[PDB]
From a paper:
Like typical Hsp70s, BiP consists of an N-terminal nucleotide binding domain (NBD) and C-terminal substrate binding domain (SBD) connected by a hydrophobic linker peptide. In the ATP-bound state, the NBD and SBD are docked against each other and the SBD adopts an open conformation, allowing fast exchange of substrates. Nucleotide exchange resets the cycle and triggers substrate release.
The activity of BiP in the ER is subject to post-translational regulatory mechanisms, one of which is the transient sequestration of substrate-free BiP into inactive oligomeric assemblies. These homomeric BiP complexes are based on typical substrate interactions between the SBD of one protomer and the interdomain linker of another protomer. As a consequence, all BiP molecules of an oligomer are in a post-hydrolysis, domain-undocked state typical of ADP-bound or apo Hsp70s. These features entail a chain-like configuration where only the first BiP molecule (A) can bind substrate, whereas the SBDs and linkers of all internal protomers (B) are occupied. Apart from the last molecule (C), which exposes a free linker, all other protomers are conformationally locked and therefore functionally inactive. This model also predicts that oligomer assembly and disassembly occur mainly on one end and involve the ‘C’ protomer because it provides a binding site for another BiP molecule (in assembly) and is the only protomer able to undergo ATP-induced domain docking (required for dissociation). The strong propensity of BiP to form oligomers and their architecture is further supported by structural data: despite being C-terminally truncated beyond helix A of the flexible SBD lid structure and containing a substrate binding-weakening V461F mutation, we obtained crystals of BiP in multi-component mixtures formed by substrate interactions between the SBD and the interdomain linker of adjacent molecules in the crystal lattice. Due to their characteristics, BiP oligomers are in direct competition with binding of unfolded substrates, which explains their disappearance during ER stress. This suggests a physiological role of oligomerisation in buffering folding capacity by transient withdrawal of BiP from the pool of active chaperones during periods of declining unfolded protein load.
Numbering used by the authors:
A (entry chain A), B (entry chain A): 27 to 549
The structure:
């Protein structure tokens, strides 16, 4: 159905891929970013920001900047998860008819309430537009991913977000399953145990998947719903805000612009520290007159976060326990999320699994969208036409008995019918005057083990040395599937035949499959 | 449950049948009679008589001969029916704890009180013993019939009579319904109106039954609780007692033996007059020295009874009115009771219904027991074992799309699963390099109208003329109901497959029944 895209609708970031011309392409947005913040903002002037522009003004507009809608989507107001989450979300969440709604000022002082799926719809519209800019065609169809623990209400609300965004959501698939598909682990023969370690922007999900003869099962899930890359950013932000106040006496926290510039540089520093052992954070015109200039070492980054990093191992032990599996039972480790680039995190996981290397080759921020895009590729095949022709074929070899009780085939099994096949036969003895033609069905080399369909004689064979007379035996299957066997002395025109009908003495479909087992033993 | 008998527990006569070896047998008692008087008597010597022996000494022992217990059974003392009936019953009926009891001398001068159901128990014991003598086995189970107008108390008291007699009364069924069942009217398709005209020994019951798609309803009942064959006997008895006194001056009424012999001959005369137009009543040693010898014509029999005969039509008009039916609305007329053999009665009924013939073939005295015996036959099936095996079958045809958007089946609907089915397919075009296998579910001939389960390709088909390559497509449903579809080029071993799971995109039981409606349109 049309161009089908794969979308990772993430808690903090979303990512869109397309299977095009034999490859998955992860599509950069209009800012050149291959991931887009799951953020929506309303400015005082009534401007609607989605993605990077929404996230890069959160500090100055805390009330009318919406994020983490995925924490609320498909949930009731009195869900204890919702009651926890609203405590630290800076925008207003209210109950309407037992459901949570996000209340914002959309411009001037005009209050609106949005369903979580309406905020997610705006994020999915941005992902759709990103894909449309790249493809230069309208995108109408999508595969959208969700956490394995999402219930039916959460899956349907996610579908509804896509519908509102103008997408036919053909399938909702589990995030860890999408990541496994991205690495082609669905093409494994046998049973494989897959550990998906997904340390994202805002949440940590560990999933134990089994793949067994083409069937994926989510056996166990654990993690921490409030541990992610942004928490490591927060630890570094805290450090540098303290440090700046010590060194200048200036309190950065109440200045939205200063904070936003520091967050920005802190994120780039974190990425650099995945490639090298120190990063310079430099901000010209940082606070009042003065610049910012500090170095962050990897050691300091690790020290500020080591308790958070170490805590990621406990959920892994819990899914192994819940799955009743040993570390040695894990066939594949799949790393998902930006945070799995952190060398300390890679070390902790590898050490936990006694040196086992994880899967490599796909950007961990992009693996879920990649898998969704692969699955989208398969579903666009729904529009193709079946270019197969059914053949009518004879189900079992047909032949006659030759000297020694030998099955001599005239019509091989899987011959297209209707058909006519002939072979030349002769006498076994000098001046032999008669032939007995015994018609057999079956795959076995000796007719004692095949099914006798009928017999007839050819009499009055003129005298000749053995092997000299030429008798043509013809098997024909007509358009009605009736078998006629003719024997003709080519020297005289002397001829006899039998008509064999599917009336009496026909094998059962059971008996046929036992006989078909002995097909392809001899040519 | 064991040998189950059917018993008509009649006001004046009872009848027992058994369904044995494909036929109802109505069982003769030890006197050779297929009906037994509902009579119990206690002689001065303490002998207990039941049936024919009780009835054939009523004249000499009026106080300790009990009959018509069915008029009292399940009723309270102050029921106006009971207060009417005790006026002309010759045995003593008394109140104990608000219920009627029959008080008799059981021998010597020893007074006993019997519940009506205890008298009926003694009659049911005689019917049980009649059936046991015939079957040469103990009879433990029965179907017993009651008037349609019997209330719950009357039905339970009848059940209690059977329990006391050593019978498990499996079902109480209505007399007119039993008669309808005897004539197989329960096997009628559509709605039928049945008029049951039951002119018994002591009571006249008219019932309008509907049979509609296997359900019997008693719509309306009427009749005369005190009009029966014995009243026609009484009219003839009166005539001949007057006639004898005129001709001899002897008053027969006070001589029990003379009266009993006349009753006897009067009953046989009545039966004869249903077959011929005169009957001779001859009694040697009738009264004192002298014999009796008189002829009764049918004309005289009819004349003595014509007012009683004519009165049977009024209840018939009343049930038609109460049922809001026309004479032409009656589909079946069922005659029940000995008295319906009387030609005048048959004439009156046929004339009332403008020449419509009643049901024929069952003795009207035996039709109710016959119906009970049929119903008993069905209930003995309660002891049989279910010799059916549940099949696991595939609910909808499974197949692939062939050229033209054609549904080509691999697994027909109602195929037993697990299963594996194969067909051979080929190319539509010379040197075609690829197949697209589209897996469909449904009964419609074109796949646009069926449910798409999934697609996959088979690539790298070697060059050959169209129709030459042989690609085997296999559908297998495993023990878990998982569908796997394989396509294999038999020339190369090149193979691909899809696993289809009941996770996503599965039809609803609603959608399945709409599709099942189109099953069996094409083979």
């Amino acid at each position: 159905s049309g161009t089908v895209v794969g979308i990772d609708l993430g808690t903090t970031y979303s990512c869109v891929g397309v299977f095009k011309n034999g490859r998955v392409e992860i599509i950069a947005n209009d800012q050149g970013n291959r991931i887009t913040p799951s953020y929506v903002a309303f400015t005082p002037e009534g401007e609607r920001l989605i993605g990077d522009a929404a996230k890069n003004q959160l500090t100055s507009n805390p009330e009318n900047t919406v994020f983490d809608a995925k924490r609320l989507i498909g949930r009731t107001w009195n869900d204890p998860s919702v009651q926890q989450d609203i405590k630290f979300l800076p925008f207003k969440v209210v109950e309407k008819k037992t459901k949570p709604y996000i209340q914002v000022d959309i411009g001037g002082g005009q209050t609106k309430t949005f369903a979580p799926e309406e905020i997610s719809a705006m994020v999915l519209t941005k992902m759709k537009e990103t894909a449309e800019a790249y493809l230069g065609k309208k995108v109408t169809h999508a595969v959208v991913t969700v956490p394995a623990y999402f219930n039916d209400a959460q899956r349907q609300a996610t579908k509804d977000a896509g519908t509102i965004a103008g997408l036919n959501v053909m399938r909702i698939i589990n995030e860890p399953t999408a990541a496994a598909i991205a690495y082609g682990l669905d093409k494994r023969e046998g049973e494989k145990n897959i550990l998906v370690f997904d340390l994202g922007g805002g949440a940590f999900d560990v999933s134990l998947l089994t793949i067994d003869n083409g069937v994926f099962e989510v056996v166990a899930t654990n993690g921490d719903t409030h541990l992610g890359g942004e928490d490591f950013d927060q630890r570094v932000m805290e450090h540098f805000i303290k440090l700046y106040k010590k060194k200048t006496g200036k309190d950065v926290r109440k200045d939205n612009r200063a904070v936003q510039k520091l967050r920005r540089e802190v994120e780039k520093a974190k990425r650099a520290l995945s490639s090298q052992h120190q990063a310079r954070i430099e901000i010209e015109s940082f606070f009042e007159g003065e610049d910012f200039s500090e170095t962050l070492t990897r050691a300091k980054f690790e020290e500020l976060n080591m308790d958070l990093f170490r805590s990621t191992m406990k959920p892994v032990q819990k899914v192994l326990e819940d799955s009743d599996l040993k570390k040695s039972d894990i066939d594949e480790i799949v790393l998902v999320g930006g945070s799995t680039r952190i060398p300390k995190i890679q070390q902790l996981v590898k050490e936990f699994f006694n040196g086992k290397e994880p899967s490599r080759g796909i950007n961990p921020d992009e693996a879920v969208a990649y898998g969704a895009a692969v699955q989208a590729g398969v579903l666009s095949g729904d529009q193709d036409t079946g270019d197969l022709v059914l053949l009518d074929v004879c189900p079992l070899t047909l032949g006659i008995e030759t000297v020694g009780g030998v099955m001599t085939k005239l019509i091989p099994r899987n011959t297209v019918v209707p058909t006519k096949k002939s072979q030349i036969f002769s006498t076994a003895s000098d001046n032999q005057p008669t032939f007995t033609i015994k018609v057999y069905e079956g795959e076995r080399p000796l007719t004692k083990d095949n099914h006798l369909l009928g017999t007839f004689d050819l009499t009055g064979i003129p005298p000749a040395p053995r092997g000299v007379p030429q008798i043509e035996v013809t098997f024909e299957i007509d358009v009605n599937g009736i078998l006629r066997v003719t024997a003709e002395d080519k020297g005289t025109g002397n001829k006899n035949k039998i008509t064999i009908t599917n009336d009496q003495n026909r094998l059962t479909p059971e008996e046929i499959e036992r006989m078909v087992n002995d097909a392809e033993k001899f040519a």
